[PDB]
Amino acid sequence: GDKNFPRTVMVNLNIHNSDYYDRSTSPWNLHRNEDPERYPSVIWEAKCRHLGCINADGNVDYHMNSVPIQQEILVLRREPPHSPNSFRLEKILVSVGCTCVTPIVHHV
Amino acid sequence: GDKNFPRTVMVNLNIHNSDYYDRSTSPWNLHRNEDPERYPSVIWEAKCRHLGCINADGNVDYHMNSVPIQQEILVLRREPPHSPNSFRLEKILVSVGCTCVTPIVHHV
Amino acid sequence: CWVLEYDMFGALHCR
Amino acid sequence: CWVLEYDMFGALHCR
């Protein structure tokens, strides 16, 4: 690593400056996770309800796929454990919701 | 506010512990934003391509809606400006991708 | 803001 | 990690 890179920085934690999961053709459920050693302590993970997507009749169409849309987000991990004022920056891969995609199928 | 709440905490910045935008029935484009006063400095915003969703024929179906899936994410804002080691925690509302939803339409 | 949490809609809240 | 960036796929990278 670079010795000029600050191994510790100061952070001021005072931040100042209907639902699609059901109506989507690729609907999802939400799973809660709580960890008091993490800040934010509560995060939610979307889980696609079905393998296929919902058609105009309200049935699952397996010729299309529900897939989760994911991104990495930043959180703070208490370090040492239980510390009220000392953390390490951490990244987590979270599923935010689902979308409906045309599958990869070859006409061979 | 609570006077026992730490107004400054230490953070160690050393983190250690095909594509759907095109194939989706609610496809999206990605817009880049760069701000050197923010860490991460580069974020991307999904913009839904269409008002409707793409049908089996490859055409836009306006009886369904493409909508963006959004979440707030945490970033660090340099404070004072240009500081290499002093920040304020900040939250940003980002669009991660789009999904296809049944519209709100009343049969009145 | 002793407790920071996401709600099920992707918004952050001080609890 | 002087420069932290998201790529267009939602992943973070040290640049």
Author numbering:
A (entry chain A), B (entry chain A): 14 to 30, 41 to 131
C (entry chain C), D (entry chain C): 1 to 15
What does the publication say?
Interleukin-17A (IL-17A) is a pro-inflammatory cytokine that plays a key role in host defense and inflammation. Binding of IL-17A to a heteromeric receptor complex stimulates various signal transduction pathways such as NF-κb and AP-1. IL-17A protein is characterized by two pairs of β-strands that are stabilized by two disulfide bonds. The homodimeric IL-17A contains 155 amino acids and is secreted as a glycoprotein with a molecular mass of 35 KDa.
In particular, the structure of IL-17A in complex with peptide 18–902 is crystallized in space group P21212 with two “half-molecules” in the asymmetric unit. Each IL-17A dimer binds a pair of peptides that sit at the dimer interface on opposite sides of the dimer. In both copies, the internal IL-17A loop (Arg31-Ser40), which has been observed to be ordered in the complex with receptor, is disordered in the peptide complex. The bound peptide forms a β-hairpin structure in the complex, which is covalently linked at the ends by the disulfide bond between Cys1 and Cys14 and held together by antiparallel β-sheet hydrogen bonds between Val3, Glu5, Asp7 and Arg15, His13, Ala11, respectively. The crystal structure of the IL-17A complex with peptide 18–902 confirmed the HDX result that 18–902 binds to β-hairpin region of IL-17A. Comparison of our structure to the published structure of the IL-17A/IL-17RA complex reveals that the IL-17A pocket occupied by the 18–902 overlaps with the β-hairpin (between strands C-C’) of the receptor while interacting with the cytokine. Therefore binding of 18–902 on both sides of the IL-17A dimer should structurally obstruct binding of the receptor. Trp in particular is able to form the hydrogen bond observed in the crystal structure to the sidechain of Asp15 of the cytokine, which may explain the higher affinity of peptides 18–902, 18–964, 18–972, and 18–967. Peptide 18–902 disrupts Region II of the interface but does not perturb the structure of the cytokine.
